[PDB]
Symmetry: none
C-alpha cells in the first residue's frame, strides 16, 4: 500500500545513473514530446525535455552535459531519461570545484542526530535532477532511506542570496523540475531532515 | 487473398497523425456526424462511427485525436474514422505504463515467443491507436502481411479479466475505432501470429 511506494523509490534512487559530457544535440519530436538522442560511451540515450527545457535546443547545440537516469529502457537498449541538461564547465575541474556542507539531521527526542557529510559538486552549472538523485543515493546507502528507517523528510538547498530549493523525500522529484539548473558556486549549504 | 494482404500492409505500414489538445463540435456530412480540424498545416475530417457518434454535439475541448487516412479528398482534407480521446492530465512517466507485449508464433515454420513491452503514452487510448501501433510494429519486426505472417489475433487483457480481441485477417471494424480504454487498466497484450 504505502510500502509499495517506498520500494519503487528505493529501486529508482539506488539504481543506475550516467554522466555524459560535452555532448552535441538537437531536439526532435517523439510523439508529443521533444527529445534529444545521442550515443556517448557504448550507450544510447533519449532525453525528454519535459520542463523549462521543452523548447531550448531546436538548433544543433554544442557543449552540453547530461545527467541521465532511466525511467525506462526500450527494446534496442536506448535509455529514456528526463531533462538533466546543462552547459559544460568553462573552467578546469579544480577551479570550479565546490564542497558545500551537506548536513543530515533527525530531530527525534532520544533517537536524533546531526551529521556533516562530505559532498562535492563537479559542475559550475548543475541540474536539480543530479543533486536530488545523488543526495538520495547517499541517504539510502548511509542512512537507510526507504528501508524502513527513514521514510519521509526533505532536502533543502540554501543559496548565498537566501533563496532555497526544497524537495520532498516522500515522492520522486517532479518531472517538470528536473530541468532546473543551479549555479554551484552560489550554493551556501544543503540540509536534509529525516523523519 | 493476395490483394487483401497488400491492402492491409500499405494501410498499417502507412501514415498516421496525432493531434493533441484540440477543440471541436460535430456536424453533418452526408449520412454521418463528423468533426473538422485544421492542426499543424494539415486538414482533417473525423467520422464519428461508433460510440462517439453523438458524443461531441456540444463544443468539446482538450481532445487528442489519432488519425489514419481512409482517403484524402479533392481539396486535400484527410478522412479518418474516430480515434478521439481526452488528453493527458499527468506526465507520460508518472505511474509509467509498460504492459507486457508477448508476440508468439508456434507452428511448422517457426517456434518463438518474444515478450517485450508496449509504452502507452496516453492515459486514455482509443482501440484504433492500439490496433494501428501494434500492427505497424508487427509488420516492421515480424513481417506481418509480408510472407508467412498473414493471419492471427491481438488480445488486449485488462486487469479485471475483460478483454478486446482483434483479428489480424482484416482491418479493425470501423464501429470499434471509438472504443476508449483506460491505459492503466491494461494488464498485458498477447499477439498470436499464424
Amino acid at each position: 500500500n504505502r510500502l509499495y511506494d517506498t520500494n519503487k523509490l528505493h529501486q529508482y534512487y539506488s539504481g543506475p545513473s550516467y554522466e555524459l559530457t560535452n555532448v552535441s544535440g538537437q531536439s526532435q519530436g517523439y510523439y508529443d514530446s521533444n527529445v534529444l538522442l545521442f550515443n556517448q560511451q557504448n550507450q544510447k540515450f533519449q532525453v525528454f525535455l519535459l520542463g523549462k527545457d521543452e523548447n531550448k535546443y531546436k538548433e544543433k547545440t554544442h557543449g552540453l552535459d547530461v545527467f541521465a537516469v532511466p525511467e525506462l529502457v526500450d527494446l534496442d537498449g536506448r535509455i529514456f531519461s528526463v531533462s538533466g541538461v546543462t552547459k559544460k564547465n568553462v573552467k578546469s575541474i579544480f577551479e570550479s570545484l565546490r564542497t558545500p556542507n551537506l548536513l543530515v539531521k533527525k530531530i527525534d527526542d532520544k533517537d536524533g542526530f546531526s551529521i556533516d557529510e562530505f559532498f562535492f559538486i563537479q559542475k559550475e552549472e548543475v541540474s536539480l535532477k543530479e543533486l536530488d538523485f545523488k543526495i538520495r543515493k547517499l541517504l539510502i546507502k548511509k542512512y537507510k532511506l526507504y528501508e524502513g528507517s527513514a521514510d519521509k523528510g526533505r532536502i533543502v538547498i540554501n543559496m548565498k542570496d537566501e533563496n532555497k530549493y526544497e524537495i520532498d523525500l516522500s515522492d520522486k522529484l517532479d518531472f517538470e523540475r528536473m530541468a532546473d539548473v543551479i549555479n554551484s558556486e552560489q550554493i551556501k549549504n544543503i540540509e536534509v531532515n529525516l523523519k
